[PDB]
Amino acid sequence: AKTTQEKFDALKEAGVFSGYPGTTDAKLGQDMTRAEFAKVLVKLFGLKEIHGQYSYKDKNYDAKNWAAPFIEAVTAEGLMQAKDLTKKIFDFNGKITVEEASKTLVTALKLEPVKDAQNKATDWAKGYFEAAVNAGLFSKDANPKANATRAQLVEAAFAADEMSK
Numbered sequence: 806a807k808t809t810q811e812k813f814d815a816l817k818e819a820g821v822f823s824g825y826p827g828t829t830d831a832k833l834g835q836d837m838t839r840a841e842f843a844k845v846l847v848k849l850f851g852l853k854e855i856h857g858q859y860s861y862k863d864k865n866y867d868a869k870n871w872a873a874p875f876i877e878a879v880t881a882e883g884l885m886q887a888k889d890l891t892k893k894i895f896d897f898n899g900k901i902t903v904e905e906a907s908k909t910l911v912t913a914l915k916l917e918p919v920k921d922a923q924n925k926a927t928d929w930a931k932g933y934f935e936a937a938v939n940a941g942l943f944s945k946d947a948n949p950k951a952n953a954t955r956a957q958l959v960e961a962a963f964a965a966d967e968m969s970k
């Protein structure tokens with residue numbers, strides 16, 4: 806039995822998390838970015854990083870962007886998609902809702918969404934949020950429409966890692 810910080814520490818040892826350069830602060834309280842989620846997904850699901858290729862036109866999406874090799878990987882693999890497919894915008898600083906994360910992780914873990922799920926999630930997400938709660942990826946009382954915190958994604962990543970092992 807481990808606290809959120811202990812789960813982060815365990816996942817850091819496993820190489821799934823690394824925290825931020827120049828601080829021991831895991832910043833568990835703040836909303837995870839789409840870039841951070843791409844990195845965690847690559848580590849969880851053993852995806853190959855794709856260096857030196859840029860599939861998006863976002864300002865400051867280039868070789869200088871640490872997240873590009875992870876964003877490219879989840880893009881090719883189809884675990885994450887463009888925010889704007891036509892303008893080819895990823896929105897790497899953008900946040901991710903609990904229900905968005907639920908669909909991505911449930912799909913990646915090859916779990917089946919729950920038919921006619923009764924919960925507060927958006928219609929497209931109801932089955933995925935329910936399946937995520939049932940598999941111990943998120944708490945039943947999480948707001949599915951709220952931005953997922955780094956704490957929530959540490960908890961989810963720890964469960965996904967244990968179920969994938």
Ligand SMILES: CO[C@@H]1O[C@H](CO)[C@@H](O[C@@H]2O[C@@H]3CO[C@](C)(C(=O)O)O[C@H]3[C@H](O)[C@@H]2NC(C)=O)[C@H](O)[C@H]1NC(C)=O
Pocket residue numbers: 821822823824825826841842844845871
């Ligand atoms: C210059 O911008 C900084 O660049 C850093 C890499 O050089 C970047 O570091 C990343 O931080 C991410 C935080 O979330 C996760 C999921 C984590 O493991 O905790 O992934 C981390 C990346 O691996 C990377 N961290 C390191 C030590 O290189 C900062 O986030 C990023 N900070 C911000 C505020 O965007």
